Amino acid sequence: TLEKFVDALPIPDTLKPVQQSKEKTYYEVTMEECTHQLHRDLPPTRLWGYNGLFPGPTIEVKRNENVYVKWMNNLPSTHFLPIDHTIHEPEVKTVVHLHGGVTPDDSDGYPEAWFSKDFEQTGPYFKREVYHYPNQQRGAILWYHDHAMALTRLNVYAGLVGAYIIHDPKEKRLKLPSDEYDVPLLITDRTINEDGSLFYPSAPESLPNPSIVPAFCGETILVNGKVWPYLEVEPRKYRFRVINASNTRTYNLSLDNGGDFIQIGSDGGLLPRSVKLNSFSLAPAERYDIIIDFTAYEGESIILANSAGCGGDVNPETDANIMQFRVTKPLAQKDESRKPKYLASYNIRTLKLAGTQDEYGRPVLLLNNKRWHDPVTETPKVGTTEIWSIINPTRGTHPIHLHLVSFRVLDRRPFDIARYQESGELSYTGPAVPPPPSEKGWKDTIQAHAGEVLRIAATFGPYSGRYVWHCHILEHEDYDMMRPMDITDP
Ligand SMILES: [Cu+2]
Ligand SMILES: [Cu+2]
Numbered sequence: 001t002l003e004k005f006v007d008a009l010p011i012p013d014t015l016k017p018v019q020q021s022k023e024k025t026y027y028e029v030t031m032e033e034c035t036h037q038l039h040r041d042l043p044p045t046r047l048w049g050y051n052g053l054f055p056g057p058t059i060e061v062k063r064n065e066n067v068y069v070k071w072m073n074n075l076p077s078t079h080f081l082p083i084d085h086t087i088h089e090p091e092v093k094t095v096v097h098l099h100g101g102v103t104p105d106d107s108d109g110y111p112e113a114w115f116s117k118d119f120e121q122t123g124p125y126f127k128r129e130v131y132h133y134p135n136q137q138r139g140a141i142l143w144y145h146d147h148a149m150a151l152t153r154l155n156v157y158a159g160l161v162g163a164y165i166i167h168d169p170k171e172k173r174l175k176l177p178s179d180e181y182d183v184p185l186l187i188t189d190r191t192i193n194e195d196g197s198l199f200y201p202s203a204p205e206s207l208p209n210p211s212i213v214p215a216f217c218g219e220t221i222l223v224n225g226k227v228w229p230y231l232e233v234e235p236r237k238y239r240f241r242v243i244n245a246s247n248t249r250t251y252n253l254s255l256d257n258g259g260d261f262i263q264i265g266s267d268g269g270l271l272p273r274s275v276k277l278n279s280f281s282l283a284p285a286e287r288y289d290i291i292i293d294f295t296a297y298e299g300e301s302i303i304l305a306n307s308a309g310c311g312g313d314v315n316p317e318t319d320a321n322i323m324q325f326r327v328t329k330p331l332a333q334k335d336e337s338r339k340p341k342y343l344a345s346y347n348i349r350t351l352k353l354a355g356t357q358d359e360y361g362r363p364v365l366l367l368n369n370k371r372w373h374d375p376v377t378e379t380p381k382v383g384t385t386e387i388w389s390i391i392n393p394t395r396g397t398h399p400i401h402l403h404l405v406s407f408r409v410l411d412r413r414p415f416d417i418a419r420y421q422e423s424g425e426l427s428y429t430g431p432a433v434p435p436p437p438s439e440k441g442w443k444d445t446i447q448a449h450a451g452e453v454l455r456i457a458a459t460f461g462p463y464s465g466r467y468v469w470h471c472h473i474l475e476h477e478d479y480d481m482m483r484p485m486d487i488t489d490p
């Protein structure tokens with residue numbers, strides 16, 4: 001297996017605008033096939049990257065900055081990963097979703113708004129080449145990634161992911177670590193062949209060939225596009241924007257010297273109060289805004305470790321490892337940053353997760369026993385607030401993402417699975433559990449654990465129109481755990 005911690009952690013450069021005035025910022029981003037060495041000991045890997053980079057460039061904007069992005073397809077006309085033609089016209093379709101954006105519906109990256117090379121052919125919901133991001137929302141870690149119908153798992157695995165940070169000037173007074181000491185960490189698990197080519201399975205364990213798989217667990221962990229990298233840090237406080245950009249894998253992170261993280265933010269921005277954590281779970285598309293205080297660790301080498309299984313227990317030599325901090329950089333200036341505790345102050349619908357079998361015996365995961373193409377049923381009115389009760393009788397956790405909105409977590413409550421099977425009665429096995437401090441703020445991708453009812457509160461606005469909601473395990477999303485969500489407007 002590849003030798004750990006021999007490549008320095010890359011820091012993606014921040015995208016520079018094509019045009020910027022005091023009232024509008026314009027960017028162009030092209031998806032290109034490219035080659036990058038993912039590890040010292042590998043030949044370069046064929047990838048698809050935004051602007052030919054993996055991950056794509058970090059996009060930085062200010063709250064309320066009026067942003068326009070022309071996303072363009074410069075990719076080949078055929079895929080290099082295995083395409084399953086049975087889960088449903090050009091083979092390569094792309095569309096960019098700004099994950100967490102408060103975005104008008106025609107710029108949200110609707111899965112059927114895809115386009116092929118040079119916009120030659122486009123999906124039924126395609127309407128505009130330049131997307132509009134008003135950024136009228138709390139400061140937060142967003143990220144952007146491909147979202148094309150029936151291809152999202154492949155296009156994201158190919159490398160189509162990157163970071164997008166909303167800075168709110170009103171948070172500067174908190175004096176959290178900034179500039180060189182504010183570092184995105186985009187975590188992606190991969191399986192890589194000896195010749196450096198990406199491996200993605202074409203079959204699970206009659207079946208069509210290739211065939212979609214129900215889950216993908218990569219053999220190797222990458223951060224910002226390098227296998228098991230190291231980062232040299234100064235003995236001081238850093239801010240890290242941790243993004244799970246993996247297809248399926250959930251991480252449970254910790255530092256092997258016993259140190260603690262300080263969580264300051266979740267998907268939807270700063271928490272009300274920061275929280276000291278020895279470990280934390282991060283499912284696909286979740287984000288954790290954290291501070292790590294390296295002051296007392298000068299000279300140490302610290303491993304960011306992982307304890308969560310993916311199809312089995314972690315391997316201490318491989319996926320138990322994420323990256324390595326080396327506290328050996330000399331202080332370049334006094335640490336003037338802070339870690340405050342106080343940070344800020346801030347209809348019902350039942351939905352069922354379930355899994356059926358298709359004509360090949362393969363599992364199909366569904367929201368409310370509906371298929372993507374069935375007539376829309378989630379149709380809240382613009383400006384209204386709802387409590388969604390998400391029932392999970394499956395054996396695993398599903399990370400549920402709603403577009404446009406962020407929401408508060410109300411509680412989780414365990415129920416009797418076997419009973420729910422027979423009669424559909426919710427026989428509760430214990431009292432409701434309010435969210436821990438990590439979930440007392442705003443979320444947009446939330447872990448619905450097995451055997452539990454999860455309640456979230458969301459206000460459906462400011463915009464109206466056709467969005468989606470779905471599980472963010474990409475293998476589930478593509479077959480077929482995604483539904484349209486219509487926010488109706490008089
Ligand atoms: Cu997403
Ligand atoms: Cu989204």
Ligand SMILES: [Cu+2]
Nearest residue numbers: 398471473476
């Ligand atoms: Cu799922």
Ligand SMILES: [Cu+2]
Nearest residue numbers: 097401468470
């Ligand atoms: Cu989505």
